[PDB]
């Protein structure tokens, strides 16, 4: 019933920032909330950003916090990431998705992420 789409996802060249944007629509208003992730080949799924749903903060990993951007449309229900200073290790499928009760089982369609340096 849940999906999560992204826009302006894809190339960019090493310090070039990016701005990601996923929007979300079905029925959540419990303890949901929206983060970006990504993932590798070969290797598992990790997250990056995500934020909650009440009024306490957002959640950065210790892989590009400092450098990567978060906030929200604070109008609907949509989600903004400005990857800046980026690297070649940031280069991969960058998937939005969702919690429920301090999970995360919501994915989204995915934006693969070219850099380089």
């Known amino acids: 019933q849940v999906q999560l789409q992204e826009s302006g996802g894809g190339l960019v060249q090493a310090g070039g920032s990016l701005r990601l944007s996923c929007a979300a629509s079905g029925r959540t208003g419990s303890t949901y909330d929206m983060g970006w992730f990504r993932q590798a080949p070969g290797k598992e799924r990790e997250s990056v950003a995500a934020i909650n749903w009440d009024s306490a903060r957002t959640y950065y990993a210790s892989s590009v916090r400092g450098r990567f951007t978060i906030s929200r449309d604070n109008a609907k229900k949509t989600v903004y990431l400005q990857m800046n200073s980026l690297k070649p290790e940031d280069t991969a499928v960058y998937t939005c998705?969702?919690?429920?009760?301090?999970?995360?089982?919501?994915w989204g369609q995915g934006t693969q992420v070219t850099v380089s340096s």
């Open positions: 998705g969702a919690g429920e009760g301090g999970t995360w089982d919501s």
